[PDB]
Amino acid sequence: SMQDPIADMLTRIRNGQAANKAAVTMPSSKLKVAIANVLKEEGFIEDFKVEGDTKPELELTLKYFQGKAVVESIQRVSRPGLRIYKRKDELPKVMAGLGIAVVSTSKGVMTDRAARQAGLGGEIICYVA
Amino acid sequence: SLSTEATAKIVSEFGRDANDTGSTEVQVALLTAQINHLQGHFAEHKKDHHSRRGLLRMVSQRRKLLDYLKRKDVARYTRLIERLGLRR
Amino acid sequence: ATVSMRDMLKAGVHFGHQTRYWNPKMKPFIFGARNKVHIINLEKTVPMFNEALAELNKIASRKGKILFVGTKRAASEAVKDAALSCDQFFVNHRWLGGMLTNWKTVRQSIKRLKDLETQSQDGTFDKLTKKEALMRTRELEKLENSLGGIKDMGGLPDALFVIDADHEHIAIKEANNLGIPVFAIVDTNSDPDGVDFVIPGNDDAIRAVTLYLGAVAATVREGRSQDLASQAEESFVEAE
Amino acid sequence: ATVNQLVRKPRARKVAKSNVPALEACPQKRGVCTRVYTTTPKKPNSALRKVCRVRLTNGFEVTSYIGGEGHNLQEHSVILIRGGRVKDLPGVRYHTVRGALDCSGVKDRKQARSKYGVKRPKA
Amino acid sequence: AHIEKQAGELQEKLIAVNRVSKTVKGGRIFSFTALTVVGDGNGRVGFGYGKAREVPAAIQKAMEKARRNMINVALNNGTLQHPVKGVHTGSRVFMQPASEGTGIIAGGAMRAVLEVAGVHNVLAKAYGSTNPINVVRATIDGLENMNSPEMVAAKRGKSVEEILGK
RNA sequence: GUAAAGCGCACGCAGGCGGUUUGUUAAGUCAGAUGUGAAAUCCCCGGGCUCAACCUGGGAACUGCAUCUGAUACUGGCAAGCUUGAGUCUCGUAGAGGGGGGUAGAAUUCCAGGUGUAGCGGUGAAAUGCGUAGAGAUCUGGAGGAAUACCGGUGGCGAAGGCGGCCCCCUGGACGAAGACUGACGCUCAGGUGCGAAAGCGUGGGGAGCAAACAGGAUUAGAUACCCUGGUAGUCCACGCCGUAAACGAUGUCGACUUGGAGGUUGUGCCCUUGAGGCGUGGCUUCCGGAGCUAACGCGUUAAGUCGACCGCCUGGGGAGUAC
């Protein structure tokens, strides 16, 4: 049933911002935190909390400017079954670097700007539009 | 649907000695016990195809729960499979 | 204004009704049914309504003319008493296609109405046969019935005063093309969608459709008054 | 549908572009005339058009248009033909090179030289 | 007019003209139909379809509908950074950020519409319906969300838009 | 969904994928490191022939390939959990799910007796049929076979098409609810076994009515079509033979998410239960419409939206679901 949970994270944000919701909650992961941190400082989410003593669970607050959406969609590019990997020299361009690719390198989760500043390549998780 | 008094003997004899219904061994032993009840209907009723659909649900699921035990401990498995006389 | 919080409770305890039908797109301000009667939520409505009254005050010094649309039988008498005089206009015999966008044809047919009404009242076509008076009488009747509460309107209005959206969607549609701010009182079957400031309300209880409108009416009118008195003071200081 | 689904069964596309069955991937081709035809158009019309059947060197057979006034073909000669479909007649996929082999140019042609095959044309 | 951009003298981009009739009930219709685009060189949504009995009145109606209830679009003359995967009624376009050093090829009148649109450089060939009315929608749905930053702070740019929503 | 195009459906091996955490490895991954890749006619920097064509040093896509060493953010492996996926025990509840048994009355139909005389039938209008051996209808009683209307409703059920007299035997699948357990045992599904709306169909059983054919009537510029009367295989059961299709959501499977109200109706907590009602929480079912999507109708929390994995299928028409 559950086969890609970071696409399901992203669909919950996507209907979240279109439907004028302030916060969106789902199951948490080490990958989910590691992503959310980058979104939090690049302002694609506002803030988040991680909570749950049994198993961790994530509640996050959405991107806006006036109250309705300013990122149209966020889609995963590397996925279950179609992993796409980028080299140091081939890190991508999303809306001329006003937008992000979130890139998991061997040294952790960061943005395309930090993956390039390090001189790493890695897994390209998701792009903005 | 299976008898109250068989279900309690099956629980007594299979899984661990806690007399639970949930572990993989007692779940093969309960599925087997309904499969066998249904094969009692299929002593006649040879044109009763819409209930045979049901048999294959219970059968397939047992096939899966056998793979799972055998992916785990082999003692429980080699016992269970010989202990319900399954296959040739 | 501070008037909106006191006003909402005092009016609202009819709770509306409208069976259990109501409108899903207003739903957050609709509290859950008590045996197939709708009950309005009065608390969540106070931020909306206070918000409306502060914007009314700011347009006071901006406006010479207000246009009241969305009038209906149970509401007409409250729309009249808020207008008081011919610097405040209203429509109650249904809205006509193009009253803002084709004001050009609408004002032309008003100019023919006030020309042939002043001709009638002096007595000028009432001579000869009854046919010759009656064919003017009938055309004057249609203009008078259609125009009667907007006949005097000296220009395109600064705001739009809505007491129902239920039958009057077009007026709102064109007012938004004309770039006019709408100040609304919507009922339970109405949607809040698509107008600039809303008061959630209900269409029954004659006391409620008056008190809602009474709060909306004070803020713009005593607002304008205070702007005018401040305009007199600025020249009169000099000459004393 | 899915990419794995595309590894398991490929893409296949629309039918490729042909209307000249000439063989050896070439615009012009030789054959011996078999028959000459007076024939009538398709689409709603009335004319007396000139077509030859040629039996091409590949041994298939095609019909080619014989354009302009002044007929010179003979029904057993070797000629060069060039692909170019005619919509006036059914299944006519060719025209004949009037300046080639046993062909002679059109009388009262000056419109084009090489086209319709006239050496130093006449008015 | 109303919300329209800081436009200066008229754009008179006539794209098409046609003439339509049923002829069913009293001889033919004489009236003509017009399709017109009115922009400003810096990026606009202005597009107007109008009609009247003879061409001069048809274009002037069409040109009004090209200019009223149209939002400003904030691209910087000839550079744009953030297009959209443009779809309008089956006529589909998919521009991406690009140098103006490279030039523009575009057929018919279209290199001319695109140079007044400010969108010539990001542009790539149409797909879906190649009908005259919908092929030109490059500058409308393909800019419906956009930015065009000149700022050194391009990498803080989406951050700056969140803290205004805070 | 309808333009060509969702497998007929369940269940599922191989293949492909894998919620979430610790241990741990390092297949794929990425960084580091080292070696390879002659030459211009192409490309870039030079140079020369009256330029250019042309030719060429130096750099280069040298359009091609390599493995060690480090990393653990990600996927692959494997062990033990977790529940957040899924599975299971007894109990209640709603229903036309399936197989075999049992059973009643009523019209056509038939027979017998009683009563009784001339049409009955058919239709647009008509004639063929049937009938004085006494028809048609009607009283009494018997006969026989499908069927079982209503209740049957926007209801409910089955795997999709599919399911309706009433009852029992045998049993599936689904809906809730309390005590309790295991703990990814998962998803999809090429090949695969299993399974028919309807008629076609071999034999036995059975036949009251209806009916392709076959006869004959009627229609009409002819009339095999249209319309009528006779009338057979079928229809009906039991077993048996390739499962066809307009095999439905004309909508793939099952799962996650998205402002809702209200109708139909049911498990169950709470209500002067007082309005097929309200509220708490599941259940199927349906009108209405926002966000979104569409060519258009339309879909909209049971999607035709946002999506998820994996699969099936389509790529101009005719000729062809045929040929091979």
Side-chain angles (χ1 to χ4, degrees):
Chain A
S1 304
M2 290 169 176
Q3 268 85 246
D4 185 21
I6 298 293
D8 170 70
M9 194 164 65
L10 288 171
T11 265
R12 298 162 178 258
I13 288 172
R14 281 182 284 201
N15 297 308
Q17 292 170 346
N20 304 98
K21 315 198 54 162
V24 179
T25 301
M26 65 277 301
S28 184
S29 186
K30 173 178 288 190
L31 173 69
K32 302 180 166 174
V33 169
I35 290 175
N37 173 26
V38 172
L39 300 184
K40 180 181 171 160
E41 69 185 292
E42 286 290 310
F44 295 89
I45 58 171
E46 187 164 270
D47 223 69
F48 66 103
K49 51 248 63 177
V50 78
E51 69 171 53
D53 302 350
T54 301
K55 68 290 190 305
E57 293 197 291
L58 162 63
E59 171 172 291
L60 61 60
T61 298
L62 315 175
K63 203 193 205 273
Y64 305 110
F65 63 156
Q66 49 81 0
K68 179 54 185 282
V70 57
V71 61
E72 279 165 89
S73 270
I74 187 178
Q75 169 73 270
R76 241 194 167 204
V77 173
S78 190
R79 60 183 225 172
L82 173 74
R83 300 297 182 193
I84 307 178
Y85 289 109
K86 291 294 195 82
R87 266 72 76 195
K88 80 175 205 299
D89 53 88
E90 310 187 297
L91 306 175
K93 267 287 177 56
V94 199
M95 308 292 182
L98 184 62
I100 63 193
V102 186
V103 190
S104 40
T105 68
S106 48
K107 300 304 175 198
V109 199
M110 48 207 79
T111 189
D112 82 77
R113 293 65 136 293
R116 183 65 82 162
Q117 283 170 81
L120 290 164
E123 195 175 271
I124 45 160
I125 297 170
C126 58
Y127 314 170
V128 290
Chain B
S1 170
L2 175 69
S3 307
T4 47
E5 182 46 51
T7 287
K9 282 277 163 213
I10 289 170
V11 167
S12 282
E13 272 63 75
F14 300 72
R16 60 182 183 286
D17 320 283
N19 290 20
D20 67 90
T21 54
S23 69
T24 292
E25 269 186 329
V26 65
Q27 283 192 341
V28 170
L30 290 150
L31 292 157
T32 292
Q34 299 176 316
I35 274 159
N36 293 341
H37 169 89
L38 191 54
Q39 199 58 41
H41 149 276
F42 297 107
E44 211 170 288
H45 318 152
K46 90 162 299 306
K47 171 169 163 267
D48 199 311
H49 295 128
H50 295 17
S51 182
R52 192 157 209 55
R53 178 182 72 240
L55 195 62
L56 182 62
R57 283 177 192 127
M58 291 187 169
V59 168
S60 57
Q61 177 64 36
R62 177 188 72 209
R63 273 157 168 295
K64 271 160 174 189
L65 277 170
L66 285 156
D67 196 296
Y68 176 59
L69 196 53
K70 196 195 67 55
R71 178 186 283 139
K72 296 212 172 192
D73 169 81
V74 290
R76 292 169 58 102
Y77 170 83
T78 52
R79 288 186 306 139
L80 173 80
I81 190 174
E82 188 168 49
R83 183 167 57 185
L84 290 179
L86 306 175
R87 308 171 183 72
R88 196 71 172 119
Chain C
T2 71
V3 190
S4 66
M5 185 175 213
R6 157 75 280 117
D7 194 70
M8 193 55 209
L9 298 188
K10 169 176 40 62
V13 316
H14 77 285
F15 309 114
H17 48 294
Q18 304 306 89
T19 195
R20 75 284 183 183
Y21 183 53
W22 88 80
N23 173 24
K25 271 162 309 173
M26 181 63 88
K27 179 55 180 63
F29 306 115
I30 290 160
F31 183 74
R34 315 295 155 210
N35 287 276
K36 62 179 284 194
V37 176
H38 132 100
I39 299 305
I40 178 181
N41 188 261
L42 314 177
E43 310 76 78
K44 282 170 72 68
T45 296
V46 166
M48 305 322 271
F49 183 21
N50 179 279
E51 205 62 40
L53 268 57
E55 305 297 298
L56 280 164
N57 276 273
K58 174 174 67 170
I59 72 85
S61 85
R62 218 182 74 163
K63 82 89 171 175
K65 312 174 185 300
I66 294 299
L67 178 65
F68 294 59
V69 319
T71 328
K72 66 158 59 186
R73 305 296 89 207
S76 54
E77 64 302 272
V79 159
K80 291 165 169 186
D81 180 56
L84 198 71
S85 77
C86 61
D87 76 265
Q88 311 288 76
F89 314 98
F90 61 81
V91 170
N92 71 324
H93 282 324
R94 296 298 278 95
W95 184 261
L96 275 79
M99 263 173 156
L100 300 178
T101 48
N102 298 338
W103 194 56
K104 73 189 172 187
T105 66
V106 165
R107 180 51 153 189
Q108 153 292 301
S109 64
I110 285 165
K111 283 204 177 162
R112 196 176 78 144
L113 162 72
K114 292 308 308 185
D115 174 279
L116 195 60
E117 200 167 47
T118 314
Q119 184 177 0
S120 181
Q121 286 165 308
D122 180 81
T124 311
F125 68 66
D126 283 90
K127 290 164 307 168
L128 322 184
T129 70
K130 208 64 70 138
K131 164 181 291 236
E132 274 171 291
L134 184 49
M135 183 179 273
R136 301 173 184 227
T137 300
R138 285 189 312 231
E139 284 301 296
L140 181 67
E141 199 204 345
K142 180 171 65 188
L143 284 183
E144 182 51 55
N145 280 324
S146 296
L147 305 175
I150 190 163
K151 59 176 184 174
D152 299 318
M153 190 181 73
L156 290 157
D158 186 76
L160 196 74
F161 266 44
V162 172
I163 178 60
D164 304 276
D166 81 296
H167 65 273
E168 206 85 284
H169 275 100
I170 305 296
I172 294 156
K173 193 184 61 59
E174 301 182 21
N176 283 343
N177 292 322
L178 268 298
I180 300 173
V182 174
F183 305 96
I185 319 147
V186 280
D187 72 90
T188 183
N189 301 305
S190 298
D191 38 46
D193 294 313
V195 302
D196 293 76
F197 302 94
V198 277
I199 304 157
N202 338 106
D203 53 76
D204 309 281
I206 319 288
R207 171 274 293 108
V209 301
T210 301
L211 275 166
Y212 290 154
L213 184 53
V216 166
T219 45
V220 60
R221 292 170 70 238
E222 280 79 77
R224 163 61 171 187
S225 294
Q226 174 46 73
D227 156 74
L228 283 180
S230 300
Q231 274 174 245
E233 290 173 82
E234 217 71 36
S235 176
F236 179 64
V237 80
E238 319 173 53
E240 303 301 304
Chain D
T2 286
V3 290
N4 184 12
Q5 199 267 10
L6 301 161
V7 171
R8 212 184 294 211
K9 179 193 199 186
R11 281 292 173 226
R13 59 184 316 275
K14 60 167 174 191
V15 295
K17 291 150 190 210
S18 49
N19 59 269
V20 173
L23 283 171
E24 197 176 35
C26 64
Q28 62 281 121
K29 189 52 54 173
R30 290 200 167 100
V32 70
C33 194
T34 50
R35 292 199 60 187
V36 184
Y37 283 96
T38 290
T39 186
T40 65
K42 62 180 190 179
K43 284 193 170 202
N45 278 305
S46 198
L48 301 166
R49 296 292 100 253
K50 299 181 284 177
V51 161
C52 37
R53 199 183 198 62
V54 198
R55 185 153 177 269
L56 290 178
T57 63
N58 74 54
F60 189 57
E61 300 198 295
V62 295
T63 49
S64 186
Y65 194 57
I66 319 176
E69 65 263 277
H71 191 97
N72 39 78
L73 209 67
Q74 305 178 305
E75 66 295 296
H76 54 80
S77 78
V78 190
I79 57 156
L80 187 80
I81 75 177
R82 181 177 293 164
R85 175 103 171 95
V86 157
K87 296 77 49 64
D88 183 63
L89 292 154
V92 168
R93 294 164 284 185
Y94 290 97
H95 79 109
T96 293
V97 185
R98 310 306 277 100
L101 272 78
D102 202 71
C103 314
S104 173
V106 171
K107 185 61 201 191
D108 297 317
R109 187 72 69 153
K110 195 161 169 166
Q111 192 280 4
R113 295 70 84 185
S114 65
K115 200 174 59 41
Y116 297 88
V118 282
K119 297 193 183 309
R120 291 297 178 147
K122 72 302 317 165
Chain E
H2 298 98
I3 63 195
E4 179 189 313
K5 206 154 162 67
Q6 294 65 69
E9 65 208 76
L10 273 295
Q11 179 172 299
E12 295 152 72
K13 214 66 159 120
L14 181 58
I15 311 303
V17 60
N18 278 81
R19 180 161 62 152
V20 308
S21 179
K22 309 205 174 291
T23 206
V24 285
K25 80 176 63 77
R28 70 207 170 156
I29 310 308
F30 287 94
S31 76
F32 291 78
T33 66
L35 178 48
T36 62
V37 153
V38 175
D40 64 313
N42 296 8
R44 227 177 74 205
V45 289
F47 173 112
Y49 205 123
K51 67 178 61 69
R53 184 159 188 214
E54 203 88 300
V55 191
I59 69 186
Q60 180 71 2
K61 289 183 179 192
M63 279 162 175
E64 286 292 86
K65 287 180 172 175
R67 97 168 114 267
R68 181 169 182 202
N69 305 291
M70 293 299 170
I71 66 168
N72 294 31
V73 173
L75 59 82
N76 296 335
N77 295 268
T79 75
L80 184 273
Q81 303 204 351
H82 193 333
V84 184
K85 186 188 165 55
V87 70
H88 187 247
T89 48
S91 183
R92 44 187 168 128
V93 166
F94 190 28
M95 320 198 287
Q96 74 186 19
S99 76
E100 309 176 266
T102 40
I104 172 69
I105 309 178
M110 198 162 176
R111 188 185 312 168
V113 165
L114 292 159
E115 188 63 57
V116 304
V119 281
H120 69 119
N121 56 319
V122 295
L123 194 272
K125 70 296 317 299
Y127 341 93
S129 199
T130 52
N131 183 20
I133 293 145
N134 283 331
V135 63
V136 282
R137 283 286 186 106
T139 201
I140 313 302
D141 298 83
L143 286 183
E144 171 81 62
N145 181 31
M146 65 53 65
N147 310 96
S148 190
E150 61 304 274
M151 77 184 77
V152 302
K155 312 303 179 189
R156 297 275 77 165
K158 290 275 173 82
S159 319
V160 167
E161 300 174 53
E162 185 69 288
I163 62 182
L164 185 63
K166 194 166 50 177

